């Protein structure tokens, strides 16, 4: 059983499909419609079911052509209000009844962001988007909101004439509504089953170019020439992908470039991949974010976690593939240089979590704990450490990649746990069963901390990296006019950026330091946001005032968490920026994303 979740179970009954037509009205920020639930019987003489619901209002369920009686239990915080419905009959095992609910969601909606147009590029129009990962479906439409269940899905949905619906789906046409002159509905066709956590909706003044056979990119009309050449890689990558994982069984890529308050990097929405704006780098430096959406087509889409407890599944053989497309593409030894910095990144994380703190598990319990609140780098990393381990003592990339492809073909279509997972290790591997009895595993899986064993990591492209920042750290005062421009000239931007973390590793450093490498390198020029970030963060915690303005303004005229929180975090700590970041978010509070604002929220202890 999922604990996330008060509906009921995949052995209870189980949701094949949903019929959803609704209407979005910016006027009261609410999307109001029915959700009609295709629900099969698992079991004998079911006479009932339970949904999920989070503040949403209920106005009847009709089975059969009848109203039918339901009712809304206690609500349990963010868990949302179980919703029960009597059946007008009892099913038998793998009978089918389709469920018909009408209902409106809140404004303060978990899964919607709802954008004035002040806040939009345009200034004209207003937007709306959803994030559903993880328990945020609830918060749109009554489902059985687990990943356990999967689900085919069509939908319709009535918006202002001058806007447009996109949907994690196939686009089938567009019509006036008939009920409506001042409206126009959209139409979408998902045909292959997904977890209800992949149903997506965007609705805005949106444009598309066409940037690959099977792959527009959408975003309002000022971001949409610099993302057609930022994500042109996209076409390649997908080839790269269908090679190491099979078919992509999904028709259309399609790429949406959000407003800068998207608290992902990007989310792997079917048919439809979310992305943050602070991607648009000028160089397409940042397109391993586009690999990792792609790869989640297999590992994530195709192959699900059964509960949020086994995340890291999703996560870490999505971060596995994502670092072999990029190796494809640009060689062996940047996998290598990925790889080693995501182990700096699982680094970072265990020191600030703590070393015994349970969200540096691999495995977690979440029973009473907000999904969100779990989120981190964690699930990716050490993930992502497990599999490159298990390449390396199995006998290589070329042999683990056959158990890669093997894993999404055993499980397509399905949900697993860790346990399915270790087995099918175990039976692929089964002549290399000694080896696999070395591992650690209950350390591995169950234990906080960095792993009991590091990958071995090429160094080529590092090096660099490293012994610029060692250069740094080392100097003193006398030593300081001896670095130049020219310490950069043969980085890439990839090494600039590890260069950073590198050095960032061992913040602070002396203010004089901090003031040099400014001059020196104009680093505050950079727009790169990994770099920028990494940059401000070293500023910020070396003490250096200057950077304040800087640092407030990247926190929050975008709303990536990955740099929103840290930045927040760091500018409390800063007693000279204390005042102003606690202002600064109470003041941008309305304006956020409500799960950002929750969590920046919960790291600043205001609110
Ligand atoms: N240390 C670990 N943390 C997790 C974990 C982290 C987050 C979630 C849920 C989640 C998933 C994606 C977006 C929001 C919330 C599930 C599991 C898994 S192992
Ligand atoms: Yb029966
Ligand atoms: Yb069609
Ligand atoms: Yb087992
Ligand atoms: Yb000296
Ligand atoms: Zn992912």
């Given at each position: 059983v999922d604990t996330c979740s008060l509906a009921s179970p995949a052995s209870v009954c189980r949701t094949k499909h949903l019929h959803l037509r609704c209407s979005v009205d910016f006027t009261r920020r609410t999307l109001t419609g029915t959700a009609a639930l295709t629900v099969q019987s698992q079991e004998d003489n079911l006479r009932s079911l339970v949904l999920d619901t989070k503040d949403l209002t209920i106005e009847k369920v009709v089975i059969n052509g009848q109203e039918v009686k339901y009712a809304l239990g206690e609500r349990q915080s963010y868990k949302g209000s179980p919703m029960e419905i009597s059946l007008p009959i009892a099913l038998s095992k793998n009978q089918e009844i389709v469920?018909?609910?009408?209902?409106?969601?809140?404004?303060?909606?978990?899964?919607?962001?709802?954008?004035?147009?002040?806040?939009?590029?345009?200034?004209?129009?207003?937007?709306?988007?959803?994030?559903?990962?993880?328990?945020?479906?609830?918060?749109?439409?009554?489902?059985?909101?687990?990943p356990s269940v999967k689900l085919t899905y069509t939908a319709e949905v009535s918006v202002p004439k001058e806007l447009v619906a996109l949907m994690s789906a196939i686009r089938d046409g567009e019509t006036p509504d008939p009920e409506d002159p001042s409206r126009k509905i959209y139409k979408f066709i998902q045909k292959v089953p997904i977890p209800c956590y992949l149903i997506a909706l965007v609705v805005g003044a949106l444009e598309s170019r066409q940037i690959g056979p099977r792959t527009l990119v959408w975003s309002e009309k000022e971001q949409v020439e610099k993302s057609?050449?930022?994500?042109?890689?996209?076409?390649?990558?997908?080839?790269?992908?269908?090679?190491?994982?099979?078919?992509?069984?999904?028709?259309?890529?399609?790429?949406?470039?959000?407003?800068?308050?998207?608290?992902?990097?990007?989310?792997?929405?079917?048919?439809?991949?979310?992305?943050?704006?602070?991607?648009?780098?000028?160089?397409?430096?940042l397109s391993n974010v586009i690999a990792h959406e792609i790869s989640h087509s297999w590992t994530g889409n195709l192959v699900t976690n059964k509960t949020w407890d086994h995340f890291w599944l999703n996560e870490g053989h999505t971060v596995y593939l994502?670092?072999?497309?990029?190796?494809?593409?640009?060689?062996?030894?940047?996998?290598?240089?990925?790889?080693?910095?995501?182990?700096?990144?699982?680094?970072?994380?265990?020191?600030?979590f703590g070393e015994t703190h349970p969200f540096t598990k691999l495995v977690v319990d979440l029973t009473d704990i907000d999904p969100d609140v779990a989120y981190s780098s964690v699930p990716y990393?050490?993930?992502?450490?497990?599999?490159?381990?298990?390449?390396?003592?199995?006998?290589?990339?070329?042999?683990?990649?056959?158990?890669?492809?093997?894993?999404?073909?055993?499980?397509?279509?399905?949900?697993?746990?860790?346990?399915?997972?270790?087995?099918?290790?175990?039976?692929?591997?089964?002549?290399?069963?000694?080896?696999?009895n070395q591992v650690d595993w209950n350390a591995w899986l169950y234990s906080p901390g960095?792993?009991?064993?590091?990958?071995?990591?090429?160094?080529?492209?590092?090096?660099?990296?490293?012994?610029?920042?060692?250069?740094?750290?080392?100097?003193?005062?006398?030593?300081?006019?001896?670095?130049?421009?020219?310490?950069?000239?043969?980085?890439?931007?990839?090494?600039?950026?590890?260069?950073?973390?590198?050095?960032?590793?061992?913040?602070?450093?002396?203010?004089?330091?901090?003031?040099?490498?400014?001059?020196?390198?104009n680093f505050n020029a950079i727009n790169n946001s990994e770099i920028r970030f990494r940059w401000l963060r070293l500023c910020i915690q070396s003490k250096w005032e200057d950077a304040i303005p800087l640092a407030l303004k990247m926190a929050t005229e975008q709303g990536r968490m990955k740099?929103?929180?840290?930045?927040?975090?760091?500018?409390?700590?800063?007693?000279?920026?204390?005042?102003?970041?606690?202002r600064t978010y109470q003041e941008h509070k309305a304006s956020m994303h409500p799960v950002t604002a929750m969590l920046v929220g919960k790291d600043l202890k205001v609110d």
């Open positions: 469920i018909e609910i009408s209902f409106e969601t809140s404004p303060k909606s978990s899964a919607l962001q709802w954008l004035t147009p002040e806040q939009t590029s345009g200034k004209e129009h207003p937007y709306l988007f959803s994030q559903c990962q993880a328990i945020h479906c609830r918060a749109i439409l009554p489902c059985q909101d687990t057609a050449y930022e994500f042109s890689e996209t076409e390649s990558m997908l080839k790269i992908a269908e090679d190491l994982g099979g078919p992509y069984v999904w028709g259309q890529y399609d790429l949406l470039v959000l407003p800068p308050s998207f608290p992902y990097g990007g989310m792997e929405n079917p048919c439809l991949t979310f992305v943050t704006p602070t991607l648009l780098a000028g160089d397409k430096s994502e670092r072999h497309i990029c190796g494809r593409l640009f060689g062996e030894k940047f996998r290598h240089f990925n790889a080693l910095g995501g182990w700096g990144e699982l680094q970072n994380s265990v020191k600030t990393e050490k993930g992502f450490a497990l599999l490159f381990y298990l390449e390396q003592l199995l006998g290589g990339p070329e042999i683990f990649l056959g158990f890669l492809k093997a894993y999404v073909e055993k499980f397509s279509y399905k949900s697993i746990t860790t346990d399915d997972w270790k087995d099918f290790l175990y039976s692929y591997f089964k002549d290399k069963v000694d080896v696999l960095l792993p009991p064993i590091k990958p071995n990591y090429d160094m080529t492209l590092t090096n660099a990296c490293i012994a610029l920042s060692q250069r740094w750290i080392t100097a003193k005062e006398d030593d300081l006019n001896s670095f130049n421009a020219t310490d950069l000239k043969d980085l890439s931007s990839h090494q600039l950026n590890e260069f950073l973390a590198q050095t960032l590793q061992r913040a602070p450093l002396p203010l004089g330091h901090i003031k040099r490498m400014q001059e020196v390198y740099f929103t929180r840290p930045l927040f975090k760091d500018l409390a700590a800063f007693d000279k920026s204390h005042d102003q970041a606690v």
